[PDB]
Structure formats: structure tokens, C-alpha cells
């Protein structure tokens, strides 16, 4: 984890979750990333993304506060803990636990600088999912349905 690689223009390639309904088209956790900013050394993260809501691309910017290390807290369709578990020049993987007042959803997001992952990057992402109990069969390719403004 090189914290300096966190801010930047990122595209979301994949999302995986135990409660798949949360990430399918029309799900509250299907978020089309555009950019991540660090508020003066990343004590807080400013995340800008599109939510395809009501057949409209809605631009949203949410702020997550650092809790400990690279674990941040964010209120977004419930309470969330977002952890940066892997960050490189071209790849970023987040681990999110969302509590909607009824159930906890464990999910991951694989972001890239490009529009895809090489087999080696996908192998790593799938491995990080297994370690957390997030089913690889529940993987969704988000960039293929990202028709929101670039």
C-alpha cells in the first residue's frame, strides 16, 4: 500500500458481493467510479461516482473518514467500512462491509486505470475475494454497462 497511488482517476471494472442483489443493475452498491481524492494526505477520501438511478446517471461525491490505517467509514445506503486492501499504479481493490439496517453485505471493487484487468490482476482480485468470503461467482463486470459520462 503506497498511499500516494490512492488519489486519481479510476474506473471500476468489477464488483463482487455475497448479497448479489446489491451490485446488479439497479442495485444501490453498483457505483461507477470516476475519481478518488485524498483530503490533505488521505485522512479522508472524496469519492466521485455515478449511480444510474431512475434511468439517469446521477453524479455523486461522498466523503469517507479514516477510522484506522486504510479503513474509512462512509454513510451511503447504510453504514459502511471501506478498506483499501490493495493499491498499485494501475490497480486498486477496496473491501466494503455495508450494513443496511437488515443485513451486512461483504463486497469488493476492482478499479483500474484502464478498462480491464490482465489475467494476473484478475487472479489477484479473485484471491483477495476468497480470503474475505466474497464469492467469485458473484462477480459483475461494471465497465461493460458504464454508459455514464466519462
Could you please describe the fold and organization of this structure?
- Helices cover 9% and strands 48% of the residues.
- The chain is mainly β.
- The protein has one domain: Beta Barrel (Lipocalin), CATH 2.40.128.20.
- Strand 4 and strand 5 form a beta hairpin.
- 32% of the residues are buried.
- Probable pheromone carrier.
- It comes from Bos taurus.
- Disulfide bonds join 38-42, 57-148.
- It is found in: Secreted.
Summarize the structure.
The chain has 150 residues and is mostly beta strands.
Highest-level CATH class: Mainly Beta
Q: What do we call the CATH homologous superfamily?
A: Calycin beta-barrel core domain
CATH overall fold name = Lipocalin
Overall radius of gyration:
14 Å
Question: Biggest sheet: strands side by side, in what order?
Answer: 2-3-4-5-6-7-8-1-9
Total beta-strand segments: 9
What is the 3D shape? Answer: globular
What portion of residues is helical?
Answer: under 10%
Keywords: Allergen, Disulfide bond, Pyrrolidone carboxylic acid, Secreted, Signal, Transport
Function: Probable pheromone carrier.
Family: Belongs to the calycin superfamily. Lipocalin family.
Protein name: Allergen Bos d 2
Layout of SSEs?
Blueprint: E1 11-17, E2 32-39, E3 44-53, E4 56-68, E5 71-75, E6 79-87, E7 91-99, E8 104-112, H1 119-132, E9 140-141
Antiparallel strand pairs: 1-8, 1-9, 2-3, 3-4, 4-5, 5-6, 6-7, 7-8
Disulfide bonds: 38-42, 57-148
Subcellular location: Secreted
Keywords: Allergen, Disulfide bond, Pyrrolidone carboxylic acid, Secreted, Signal, Transport
Amino acid at each position: 500500500i503506497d498511499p500516494s497511488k490512492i488519489p486519481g482517476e479510476w474506473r471500476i471494472i468489477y464488483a463482487a458481493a455475497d448479497n448479489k442483489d446489491k451490485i446488479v443493475e439497479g442495485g444501490p452498491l453498483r457505483n461507477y467510479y470516476r475519481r478518488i481524492e485524498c483530503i490533505n494526505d488521505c485522512e479522508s477520501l472524496s469519492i466521485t461516482f455515478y449511480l444510474k438511478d431512475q434511468g439517469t446517471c446521477l453524479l455523486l461525491t461522498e466523503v469517507a473518514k479514516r477510522q484506522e490505517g486504510y479503513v474509512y467509514v462512509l454513510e451511503f445506503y447504510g453504514t459502511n467500512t471501506l478498506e483499501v486492501i490493495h493499491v498499485s499504479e494501475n490497480m486498486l481493490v477496496t473491501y466494503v462491509e455495508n450494513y443496511d439496517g437488515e443485513r451486512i453485505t461483504k463486497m469488493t471493487e476492482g478499479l483500474a486505470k484502464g478498462t480491464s484487468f490482465t489475467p494476473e490482476e484478475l487472479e489477484k482480485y479473485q484471491q483477495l475475494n476468497s480470503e474475505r468470503g466474497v464469492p467469485n461467482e458473484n462477480i459483475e463486470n461494471l465497465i461493460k454497462t458504464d454508459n455514464c459520462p466519462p
